[PDB]
Design a protein around this ligand. Structure first.
Ligand SMILES: [Mg+2]
Ligand SMILES: [Zn+2]
Lengths: 218, 122, 164, 37
RNA sequence: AUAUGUUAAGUGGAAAAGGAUGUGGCGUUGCCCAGACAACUAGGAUGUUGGCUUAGAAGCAGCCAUCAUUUAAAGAGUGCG
RNA sequence: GGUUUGGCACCUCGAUGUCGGCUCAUCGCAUCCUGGGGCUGUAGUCGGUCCCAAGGGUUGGGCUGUUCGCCCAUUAAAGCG
RNA sequence: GACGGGAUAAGUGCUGAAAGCAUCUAAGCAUGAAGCCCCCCUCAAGAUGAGAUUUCCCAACUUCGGUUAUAAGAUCCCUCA
């Protein structure tokens, strides 16, 4: 059991040894570090607190997240670590391992292993019904005027209210996502790069998050 | 992709030249088809002679599709036309010849009598 | 009343009771509304009234003290024969194996004071102290292939017969 | 089983009992298995 | 709250023909220690399907002629087929 | 039961717009398929009937304005409201 | 889409009386469906019961209560996805 962070950078091609073309995701686990170790003794759950991008030291008169407010620095000086931009946890891990304040290098992973992922989805604005939900559009000609709009909401003069679960134009994008049952292809420790079969919810340079699958079959 | 009310050529010794795709056997209301997918067709014209006639209705097995198939090696293929072949659930044809070359992925479906005849398995 | 034969000790504590014997020992509980004595080598049932329910608990509890007291000295047994072709059965390990034309064999595990006894490949028996346990287990076997109706190919108690 | 709101012993051996408030019968002949409700 | 019973169903806090070993009440009355009911073991008819029979059917196709005594005791069969 | 054809004339005449189809669905269960079961005049595969169960699914076309309906070809099933 | 487990309806039982027998049930014990729940994905402390953890800032004015411009921090402003 294990899990790391990373960054979607791009997708490519890569071949199996039977000649089967195999698509692939690229991800970068650069500068992963463990920061804090949240026991069940105090909090009520056993987990691992983590950090990914090196950022810089304390402000002087300074400004946004490129640099670091003191409390972050007060958290990263703690375990002999440089301050980090993205912090995330990982429950369901062998907390007996992972001393506070080390690295979670890609070598924990291995070719052939199965995984899930997590990440934000993509930017998408006020999208209509049929693009948000996939409803079916209406007729063009034969004189109509109902091309794309969401249809008749509800029932009648009775059942006056409109039920909550309906389907309407709102934003389509920002959502936590998970994609069970992907596989790993390769682990290049040189560039500290990993490769994941299939494709992941992310934009370029976005956040991506990984862990060992749960539905192995058990 | 091949679907309902789609007209095709043919390949065999039938006495027939083109057909119509009524239904595209599979599942619970498939719309589509590709190489390998058996279908239920009929006949909209005929050359003279031959066993089959106008107004008839029989099955067929698709081959020579115009939006070809992706092989798992990452290679593709494309013909120009669409076509089919007549069949009787021996999975062996009525006909005696096959013009118009064949797509090989039929082999997974265990069709070999028409693959005996086709220039060429491709 | 109830007998207390040789080497069968009797110790009662209100609702719970413990009784002892050669083939083992039991510890059952009863309804506390009942009442009890122990005469020297014999037993004295009580009920508090002629109420409806109390009659039930009276005759019942006779039956249960009888069950313990007979089980500890004698213990009980059940005869679950197999009849058919390809039917085979054998205690192997602490557990039982079976082979009945299913694509897979079967496993069964015991309890304390249980003994999956066998005479040979196609007949078995369990012998124990609690009549309850041995029969419950017996149906957990017999439920796996009930007696089919035409030929009788299947697990069965012995006297159980055929019904097309 | 034969579920019928009318219940009456169809033959001599059919013996009547109440199981869970409901009524049933037994005969050792399955084709006489009746439940009331 | 008081005294007295009933209900075991959320009846109360919607519904009929009809069905039932649910319980309670008021009565009629049979069998019961010259040892009842009930189950277990103990026996089951002798000739004889006996007449007329019915595929053979020998408690039994059923139309019944359906007697006595081996006898605790049993019917030209209580009965299961 | 209150889905039909009806009876009634209680709201509505200083306006409650009706058939059918498109998009949207939502619900009940007296279940059309899957799941589990009992019985069988169930040898097996296929079945008939009854019970629990409403979690999900319940198709394309021809024909008419069409509910309905007939038909073609599919399908595990092509539900009643 | 799972696997898997917990409790379950229909049903099958075990022991067993009321009712010496038989009895799946009233005392007791088990068993059993895509259903219920738990697990799976997501949102979510305005859950006014407003949570918990780590870290950071830390004066002078005697109104005593209180006031202050500032601290950490965030913003106004600007370049841009
Ligand atoms: Mg036309
Ligand atoms: Zn009967």
């Amino acid at each position: 059991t294990k899990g790391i962070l990373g960054r979607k950078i791009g997708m490519t091609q890569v071949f199996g040894e039977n000649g089967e073309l195999i698509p692939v995701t690229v991800v970068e686990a650069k500068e992963n570090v463990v920061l804090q170790k949240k026991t069940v003794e105090v909090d009520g759950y056993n987990a691992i607190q983590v950090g990914f991008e090196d950022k810089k030291a304390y402000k002087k008169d300074a400004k946004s997240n490129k640099y670091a407010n003191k409390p972050a620095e007060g958290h990263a000086k703690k375990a002999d670590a440089a301050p980090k931009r993205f912090i995330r946890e990982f429950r369901n891990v062998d907390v007996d391992a992972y001393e506070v304040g080390q690295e979670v290098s890609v070598d924990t992973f291995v070719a052939g292993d199965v995984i899930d992922v997590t990440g934000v989805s993509k930017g998408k604005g006020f999208q209509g019904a049929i693009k948000r939900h996939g409803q079916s559009r209406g007729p063009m000609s034969h004189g109509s005027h109902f091309h794309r709009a969401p249809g008749s909401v509800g029932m009648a003069s009775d059942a006056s209210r409109v039920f909550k679960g309906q389907k309407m134009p709102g934003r389509m994008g920002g959502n936590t996502v998970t994609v069970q049952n992907l596989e790993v292809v390769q682990v290049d420790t040189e560039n500290k790069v990993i490769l994941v079969k299939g494709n992941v919810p992310g934009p370029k340079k976005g956040l991506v998050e990984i862990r060992t699958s749960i539905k192995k079959g058990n | 992709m091949i679907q309902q009310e789609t007209r095709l050529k043919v390949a065999d010794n039938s006495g027939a030249r083109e057909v119509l795709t009524i239904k595209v056997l599979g599942g619970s209301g498939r719309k589509t088809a590709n190489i390998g997918d058996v279908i239920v067709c009929t006949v909209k014209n005929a050359t003279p002679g031959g066993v089959v006639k106008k107004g008839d209705v029989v099955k067929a097995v698709i081959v020579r599709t115009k939006s070809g198939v992706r092989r798992n090696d990452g290679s593709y293929i494309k013909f120009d036309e669409n076509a089919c072949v007549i069949i009787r659930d021996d999975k062996g044809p009525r006909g005696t010849r096959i013009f118009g070359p064949v797509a090989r992925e039929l082999r997974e479906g265990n069709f070999m009598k028409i693959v005996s005849l086709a220039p060429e398995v491709l | 009343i109830i007998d207390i034969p040789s080497d069968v000790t009797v110790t009662f504590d209100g609702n719970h009771v413990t009784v002892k014997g050669p083939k083992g020992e039991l510890s059952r509980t009863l309804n506390e509304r009942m009442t009890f004595k122990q005469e020297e080598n014999t037993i004295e049932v009580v009920r508090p009234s002629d109420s409806k329910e109390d009659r039930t608990n009276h005759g019942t509890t006779r039956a249960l003290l009888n069950n313990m007291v007979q089980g500890v000295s004698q213990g009980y047994v059940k005869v679950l024969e197999l009849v058919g072709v390809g039917y085979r059965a054998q205690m192997q390990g602490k557990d039982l194996i079976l082979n009945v034309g299913y694509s897979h064999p079967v496993e069964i595990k015991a309890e304390e004071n249980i003994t999956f006894s066998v005479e040979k490949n196609t007949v078995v028996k369990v012998e124990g102290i609690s009549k309850e346990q041995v029969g419950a287990l017996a149906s957990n076997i017999r439920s796996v292939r009930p007696p089919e109706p035409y030929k009788g190919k299947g697990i069965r108690y012995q006297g159980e017969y055929v019904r097309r | 089983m034969k579920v019928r709101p009318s219940v009456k012993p169809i033959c001599e051996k059919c013996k009547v009992i109440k199981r869970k408030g409901k009524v049933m019968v037994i005969c050792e002949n399955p084709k006489h298995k009746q439940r009331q409700g």
